[PDB]
Paper text:
The GlmMF369 variant lacks the flexible C-terminal domain 4 and was constructed to aid subsequent structural investigations. On the other hand, diffracting crystals were obtained for the CdaACD:GlmMF369 complex, in which the GlmM protein lacks the flexible C-terminal domain 4. The crystals were obtained under two different conditions (see Experimental procedures section), and the structure of the CdaACD:GlmMF369 complex could be solved at 3.6 Å (Complex 1) and at 4.2 Å (Complex 2) by molecular replacement using the B. subtilis CdaACD and GlmM (dimer) structures as search models. While obtained under two different conditions, complex 1 and complex 2 were nearly identical and overlapped with an r.m.s.d. of 0.22 Å. The three complexes obtained in the asymmetric unit were almost identical to each other, as indicated by the superposition r.m.s.d. of 0.15 to 0.20 Å for complex 1 and of 0.15 to 0.16 Å for complex 2. In the complex, a CdaACD dimer was positioned in the large groove at the top of the GlmMF369 dimer and formed interactions with domain 2 of GlmM. Based on the atomic-resolution complex structure data, we suggest that GlmM inhibits the activity of CdaACD by preventing the formation of active head-to-head cyclase oligomers.
GlmM is a phosphoglucomutase enzyme catalyzing the conversion of glucosamine-6-phosphate to glucosamine-1-phosphate, which is subsequently used to produce the essential peptidoglycan precursor UDP-N-acetyl-glucosamine. As part of the current study, we investigated how the activity the B. subtilis c-di-AMP cyclase CdaA is regulated by GlmM, a phosphoglucomutase enzyme required for the synthesis of an essential peptidoglycan precursor.
Residue numbers in the entry:
A (entry chain H), B (entry chain I): 107 to 252
C (entry chain F), D (entry chain C): 2 to 369
Write the structure that this text describes.
Amino acid sequence: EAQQKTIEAITKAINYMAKRRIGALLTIERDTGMGDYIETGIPLNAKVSSELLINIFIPNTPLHDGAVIMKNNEIAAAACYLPLSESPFISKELGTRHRAAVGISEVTDSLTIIVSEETGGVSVAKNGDLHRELTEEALKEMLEAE
Amino acid sequence: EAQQKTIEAITKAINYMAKRRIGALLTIERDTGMGDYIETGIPLNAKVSSELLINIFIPNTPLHDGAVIMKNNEIAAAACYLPLSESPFISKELGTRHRAAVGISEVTDSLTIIVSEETGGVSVAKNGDLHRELTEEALKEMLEAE
Amino acid sequence: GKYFGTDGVRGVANSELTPELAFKVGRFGGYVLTKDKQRPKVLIGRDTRISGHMLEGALVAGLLSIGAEVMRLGVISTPGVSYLTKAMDAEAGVMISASHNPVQDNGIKFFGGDGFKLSDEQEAEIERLMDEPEDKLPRPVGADLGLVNDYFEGGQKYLQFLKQTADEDFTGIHVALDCANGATSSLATHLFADLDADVSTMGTSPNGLNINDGVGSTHPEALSAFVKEKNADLGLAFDGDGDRLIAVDEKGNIVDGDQIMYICSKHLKSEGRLKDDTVVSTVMSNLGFYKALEKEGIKSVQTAVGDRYVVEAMKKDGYNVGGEQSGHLIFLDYNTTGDGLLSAIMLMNTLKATGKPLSELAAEMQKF
Amino acid sequence: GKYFGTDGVRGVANSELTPELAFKVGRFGGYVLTKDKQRPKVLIGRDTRISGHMLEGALVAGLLSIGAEVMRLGVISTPGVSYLTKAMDAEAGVMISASHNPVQDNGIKFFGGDGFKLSDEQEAEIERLMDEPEDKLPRPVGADLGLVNDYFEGGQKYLQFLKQTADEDFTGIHVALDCANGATSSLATHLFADLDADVSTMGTSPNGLNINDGVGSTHPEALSAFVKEKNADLGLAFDGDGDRLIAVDEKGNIVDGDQIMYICSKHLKSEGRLKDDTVVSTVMSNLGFYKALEKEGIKSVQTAVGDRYVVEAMKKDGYNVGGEQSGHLIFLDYNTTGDGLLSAIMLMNTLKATGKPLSELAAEMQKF
């Protein structure tokens, strides 16, 4: 229904940035009402399109420095700040954003995607479990579940 | 009231771009309903904030290529496309985005702000009359009337 | 024959550097680099030259005709190419520019996966194949063809890389900019303005025809008078492709490559980052430059003219700094060929960390 | 030799239709069309073929090498080119597409200033210079080079144009769109959406490799299933370049080009707009097509297959409507070639104006 659009746009946004190695931190709200974490980033309330997401995580802008929050099928806010986790199972040499993505699924029923600004590999974080180097179909099958 | 914000949001966003010489183009609907020009960009329906307008025009992105439209105190759509004016009073120095700014104030009761990507000069277009090289107070006063 | 000189292949566009030739470059130059994987990653960047569009098309037509993945960059300096090619693990990069030369000239230059000039072995085979009058190289078809996805945002990537190398923002400094109407135009003005600095723009208005026309590192006289005019603290004069830097002090005097090299390598030895406290340069450098080096206790090694030798010596010995009189300066901690804005950032680090005007920092070096 | 067939130059791309050829095309053809002003104005469009990027680059390379001013359109339907080349007083236009053919095949088409296929005299001189083994044409240098200013906005000047050719908006009509993963993808969807129609899309997700794959005017069985699935009042099926159109009614049945020619020209006679009440067609047109034409007092001219003869018919005598059983419908009141969307909007005009559903309007002509 309304689930085939907004999922199409997310996949096209993610495949865009992963070919270009642009740091990407994308959280989607499900059951855990993350209202306290939305008020830390620039309010948007904008309808989701692949082009708006790519513009949000551009190298140096006011909005890039953080996460994009996804309540309903809208972009709640951008540049939001999440908790880090300090779990030992984070391979060091990365993190910063990876640490804050597994850190927001440790507290919530949400789902967080990341594109590593060092390699371009698409990650995913559900309930404190991180899966590195996801494929394109892998992300779609994964999202179709949501 | 609710007018000081969204005006403070535009000024600090335009002064952002003027120091860096980024070509902008923002039109502010008033009485002329601009539906047949909002259905030409990437719809958003977002809430106005300084940092979001900045990310919209970044030298080359999906959303950069066109004109920001502002219905209500909402960013109605981005990458919108405006008609050109072909008026002889447009100094042949400039054009493209200044040619459309006056070109959309010819049809409408709208107000356009322009940042010239060659000089950084903030301009403004209302009822076919454009005014180059505007000052900060002169953009703040022009916007307080709306 | 002899297509690949020092700065790659060059010539006056359409007449010598025909679009027919630039296509043959990207088709054979793509096949040499294709020996690893079947879809290599070649990005491409150019300056503002009106020929640049025609050549950019003929080149990519060759790159897609052997199945290479191409990323167009639009207008970006040759530093930005080098930085992105290595930073995206791409198999090579291309620059369509002819640096400081008149507008009617253009050229093609190549960089390896590491961000250095293509090995002379590869350039041999490219020339080998430009002599067989038979195009018996493969012709992929269907989905085997090349792919294209633009990356015009690669600008601010390299720009994001430049911003961090500032020890701090340059608040309280009025700087004039001469961009030669080149690839540095839209790039530089973002940089120092985002670093909180009073910017005054000239040569920041290209139109594909006005590259290096009375402006740039090769004709600093226009910037000399403009600095005094806006009474700037200094002025920076990049060239066409943004690989050289020629500074001008508040007095309006010109500040050449050897005065920039001294001013910066002294500040680096202070921060200790100067590796082994040595600097590399060419025969062209001035005598007093070395005398002033001695006075600060900085060793030095010398190499031939041309920067493929300046880079060769820093390589084997692991040296930090190296440049030319030309204003072509290489910081190997950061980039792999001569960066004009990165040299400019390091000069501003000096001016802010010490607080002296640029005339005073330059006077430490007494030209013979 | 023989480069210009019916739909311009064709061949599977890279192996046959080579980028070397596509450069010879715009360099020699641009010269043939440069004979008036020393700076012609050719604008160039293409479909979604992944080879379309290769040839477009190689094409523009030739045009820039003889001084022609080039406007890139990007992805737009071939009817859009013809409308823009004429509505901009530009000297010619080029469409890199190979309608309804597989993704591997591509082709160069040429339109004149008026919007028709180039005069057979010019196409002759084009293959003339392709036979001389000496590229002895002029090679402008410096300022005299070609010029390229992108016009990706032509997509909506062609869209604005179709918007007015809707006698009113299609509120309350649900339509299912198959655009063949071709040029009409982004165009058609906006059109009927801003026309306040209940749009339902499929085959509107192109990726340079899926064009004309089980979708489009040639493979209608996907839409037919789809139209019944979402119970849409009708289905429209453009092709890869958007010049043909195949309709699907609410029952799911197919509505070929003869049937759409009947539906529209019948409704046009009711508005006095059918010139002399005659329609041009082909030998390929079914017998019952002509049987129900006379039943409505509409005369008919028959010509040979190929729309260069259906347009030649409508040329010498000033007729209003012609077309083929293929779905290639020409409405000379608005455009110079076959238009899928213009054909589509005329159909929508008939659907809204009589209220009747499409099955009923198509039942008046009985196929033999």
